[PDB]
Write a protein that binds this ligand. Structure first.
Ligand SMILES: *Cc1c(COP(=O)(O)O)cnc(C)c1O
Ligand SMILES: *Cc1c(COP(=O)(O)O)cnc(C)c1O
Lengths: 369, 365
């Protein structure tokens, strides 16, 4: 007769009529819509991953190291070297992407009866994971320049007393880092925890927010990923930096053995080539400034970025423009900001192609006053 | 320094301890139900080669929907059970743990409840708790098997949104009969999750054959951690009507399954026949252990898996410590008078048995 549908299943009412996350598939020539490193791993990196996976592969019949100690120590070491801030294993917690880190953090510190705040436009997954963990999502507005409006942000935290304060720095999708003084103002008033999502920290010209953990150990958690600068999006590894008591809190919410032996071994291999991979950052940053200068030169408004992408406009109709970029063979991202789109910084050839299409597409800019 | 108490942790996480036995140094480990046979060079080479291929593009995000893996999973289980399954019917995640978490997210959670029939699997209450699904218990029979009248009555009475059934059961090893299963499915108002982690060991048909009959209710879970000897890769999956997969897409964290995890697991599946050729030998060992334990005075619950619940100790935790002192690590599952011994290599079973001969003197007369 009729196959059973989702309507026929006893799904939660609060999940009814919702669509799954994710843009539909597209294998088109130029993809600059997810903030991936465009430089594939080097042969030497691939060999080290492979050798580390081969080593662990002989004991696949056994459960992996539950607490992933060696990985966490290697993350501590990388980040110590990277920021001059002294960190060890006990300050680090890892999981399958930042997504899972955020989920774990909201289970421990948000969840039912609790709330989280974001300053918008910011990162799409923050409200989605809040929703997923049944944490109330609250919004306050960034400034007209897309940067933080710190008085508005502070007033909202004071008024609403959210359990979790989200701050993305460099922000996605505008690319702007939050100044440390703005950060400290929020930290001062946040009553629960603050999560500073430093997914783009490696690309940024200002100190890591890990420098502040010592100053705010009962509130501050910093998150990083291996998905962007580290060119390890395929391996799904994110981590957090905090006071050791936060690690104990993660042990209460994490699914035991969440990190596989394969994943732990591969990530360790990626970290042993950190210097090799992060050498790119220089070139990507250069390319991002070349793109920015060229778009500016052509009459586009471009938000200055501290990350590996660019938010730019102002289109009279941003989705129409996004469709035109598509017709030219360029996949960039519509992040739901009226009049703006977000273009990931790619290989030179890909950026050249983005710019060539933008030259033609500049005719759909809002006319000037 | 700040402690966990000084953090603004949820009130309902206070007083809780992290899940997991500390990973101790002992010569014979028979406390987690892993397959004791390491992978062959043929399997390892395939995994490595497949991961190398995946490693070339680690800069890119993986297949979101893990399509080829799910289809291979459907191929395996089709050939295994004779029940025609497609990619349509399969969802995979990082272990049954994440499978269970996702199911509870979609079908359990705040305001809703789950029931278990005890003693059974420790992670069912833990993942219910973790998803804020209320946890309800009804007792199994004295023989550790299901008491179907009590189970059915508790489901009718409490109208749980999720009914957990472990089959074969952990820790008793007992499969739930198809008729008992059908009685609970009939009364279940929401969904029933049949956790079929030990299905490869079981002498009875998989519950997947019932999905056709209860498509709006029945979800079956399976794992690669046990018979499949792939615990280290963390890969679990469910089998259900295609609409349940659509539900999983609403709760899953996008890109939850790494490109590396997908390639490794697909490689392991290409060697399923060879890996699973140990099943018969493991069962033979389990039966030998059972007989030997019986001959020494122990009571052993008949098992349909790769372990044995046995007793009756005057002091089961104390007994667990004797085994430990004797070099043998089994599992205390918190059942007074009983302990759980995984079936391992012949040598390991002999050592367990050898220790069991002296520890027999601690048995209730
Ligand atoms: C891309 C991005 C991430 C990365 O998520 P993973 O799960 O680590 O891939 C995290 N946070 C922000 C703000 C991002 O833009
Ligand atoms: C061992 C076991 C599992 C396996 O869990 P994974 O997360 O897949 O390793 C699942 N269910 C039961 C009842 C078990 O005993």
């Amino acid at each position: 007769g009729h196959p059973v549908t989702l309507d026929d299943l006893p799904l939660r009412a609060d999940l009814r009529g919702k669509a799954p996350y994710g843009a539909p598939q597209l294998a088109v020539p130029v993809r600059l819509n997810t903030n991936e490193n465009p430089h594939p791993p080097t042969r030497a990196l691939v060999d080290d991953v492979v050798r580390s996976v081969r080593e662990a592969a002989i004991d696949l019949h056994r459960y992996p190291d539950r607490d992933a100690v060696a990985l966490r120590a290697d993350l501590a070491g990388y980040l110590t070297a990277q920021t001059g801030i002294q960190l060890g294993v006990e300050n680090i917690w890892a999981a399958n992407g930042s997504n899972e880190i955020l989920q774990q953090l909201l289970q421990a510190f948000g969840g039912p009866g609790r709330s989280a705040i974001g300053f918008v436009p910011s990162y799409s997954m923050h409200p989605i994971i809040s929703d997923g963990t049944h944490t109330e999502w609250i919004e306050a507005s960034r400034a007209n320049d897309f940067g933080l409006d710190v008085d508005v942000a502070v007033a909202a935290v004071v008024d609403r007393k959210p359990d979790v304060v989200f701050i993305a720095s460099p922000n996605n999708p505008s690319g702007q880092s939050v100044s440390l003084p703005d950060l400290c103002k929020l930290l001062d008033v946040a009553p629960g925890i603050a999560i500073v999502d430093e997914a783009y920290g490696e690309f940024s010209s200002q100190p890591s927010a890990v420098s502040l953990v010592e100053e705010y150990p009962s509130k501050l958690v910093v998150t990083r990923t291996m998905s962007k600068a580290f060119a390890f999006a395929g391996g799904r590894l994110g981590y957090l930096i905090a006071t050791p008591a936060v690690i104990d809190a993660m042990l209460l919410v994490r699914l035991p053995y969440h990190l596989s032996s394969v994943t732990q071994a591969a990530a360790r291999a990626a970290l042993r080539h950190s210097d090799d991979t992060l050498s790119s950052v220089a070139a990507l940053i250069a390319e991002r400034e070349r793109v920015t200068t060229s778009l500016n030169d052509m009459g586009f408004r471009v938000i200055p970025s501290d990350a590996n992408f660019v938010l730019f406009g102002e289109f009279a109709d941003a989705p129409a423009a996004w469709r035109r970029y598509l017709e030219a063979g360029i996949l960039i991202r519509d992040v739901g900001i009226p009049g703006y789109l977000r273009a990931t910084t790619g290989l030179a050839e890909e950026n050249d192609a983005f710019l060539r299409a933008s030259a033609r597409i500049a005719t759909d800019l809002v006319p000037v006053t």
